[PDB]
Symmetry: C3
């Protein structure tokens, strides 16, 4: 009856008491685990906040590096064009210098050639001047350029003027003896001629012979 209803309550009350104590232990365990979770949350928020700032710094550093590198790339491209032209320019100036060196090599050979050719010609002029000076001089000292009477010169020709009594016989000067007056060229020269029965020569004087008048005296 009423004792049965009380006994049933006491039975349930003991179960309620045991279950309440178990729920309390479980709720205490859940609370501790929540605190540990809130601590982990705070640690994670701080680590993530630090990681986010570090990432932002890395993005600034990388972005600044990319621009510096981009600049370096253009400068290297400009220097590559400048070295390329410098190698072309130096190759051209070397070809131009070598072509000029060949021209100087030819000019040095032509200068040396003119030096000996002029030396030969200067020596030749000295040789001709000396030989001709000596030859002209010999002629000037020894050639006949004037003459005294009976000789005369007209246009490089010398002639001899002769008066009557002197003439040319063959190629020679001779004594002219016209007619017959007792003069003759004989016995190597000029001789006088006389009748040898009438005349004689005594002391180189014409003399009448001693016997001339013998026929008259007889």
């Amino acid at each position: 009856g009423l004792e049965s209803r009380v006994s049933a309550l006491e039975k349930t009350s003991q179960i309620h008491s045991d279950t309440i104590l178990r729920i309390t232990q479980g709720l205490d365990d859940a609370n501790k685990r929540i605190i540990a979770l809130e601590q982990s949350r705070d640690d994670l928020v701080a680590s993530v906040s630090d990681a986010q700032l570090a990432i932002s710094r890395l993005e600034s550093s990388i972005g600044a590096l990319q621009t510096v590198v981009n600049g370096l790339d253009s400068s290297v491209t400009q220097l590559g064009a400048r070295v390329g032209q410098l190698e072309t320019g130096l190759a051209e100036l070397r070809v131009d210098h070598d072509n000029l060196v060949a021209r100087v090599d030819t000019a040095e050979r032509n200068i040396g050639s003119l030096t000996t050719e002029l030396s030969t010609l200067t020596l030749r002029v000295t040789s001709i001047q000396a030989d001709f000076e000596s030859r002209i001089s010999t002629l000037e000292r020894t050639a006949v350029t004037s003459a005294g009477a009976p000789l005369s010169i007209r246009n490089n020709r010398m002639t001899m003027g002769l008066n009557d009594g002197l003439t040319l016989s063959g190629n020679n000067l001779a004594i002219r003896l016209p007619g017959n007056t007792g003069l003759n060229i004989q016995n190597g020269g000029l001789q006088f001629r006389f009748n040898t029965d009438q005349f004689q020569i005594v002391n180189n004087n014409l003399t009448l012979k001693t016997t001339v008048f013998d026929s008259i005296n007889s």
Copy 2:
């Protein structure tokens, strides 16, 4: 009395059972949600640790790359100075070459004139030598340089030496006949003169005239 007290206890006891069951249900659900949070927490810790390590590596590699980019920047600057010096040096040498070319241009033009003027002078010396050689030798072959007696040369003048018997009549050679000895220049030359009543000529001999009785 007790029936009402027990009845009240029974009513509260039934409410307690129902609330206890709902609380157990709630605690069970809270426990399941705590487990999921602990697992999520473990996964976050692992991923944050991995993120920190990766950041640390990015910091190291950016730093090393900055050092290399700094070294590259200085090299590009040093090369830029060297290139500009080479560009000036080549432009200076091209000017110095072009000026020396102009000096060779005149030298080549001066050699060409010297070669021409020497060639004309050589032909002139040959021309002068041949003309004078012929003229001198003609004079050396034909000119009178000596003479035999009665001719003599003194200071380029030729004279004729004359003995008594030969003289000048004007500028002509003549026979000298001093005084009157019967010799005379007449009838075109030398003749002997005699009295024509006392002498005659027979075979070019002076003869006494026959009519002298």
Copy 3:
């Protein structure tokens, strides 16, 4: 007895009601804190995921930049080698040009000395030509190169041909009178001689003296 048991149950029933309410308050506190942790967890997942995505992007950028930088380093090295070859080349051309400048410096001095020597010789040749021309043509105009008889030239020597009657007394032209014929060179020239007791000269005529007949 039974009333003592009822009173024991009532006391326990009130303790149960009070603890149930405290557990209800505790469980409610737990649920609020769980909801907040779940939302914080969702935000952390989103923020960690954003950070992981940002990290992988930086890793790609660093990898790509390192590639470019190594290429640039390779490019600067080759350039530095070309620059060094250009420097040794320009220094070689400068030496070669300055050695040619010295060769042109001596060649110009040689050309100048050769212009002087050729100019001096040209004037000298003209002087020799003018002096010799005058002297030669003076000899050509005045020198004796031919002679009329009795003068004759043989090998630049002039002689005079003489017939009998003409000879030489030393270097002088003389009349030759062989033997004793009455002719003699006396009183400055040619005279005829005669016996002055038998002959006389009257009007330059040989005459017999009157005394010869007596």
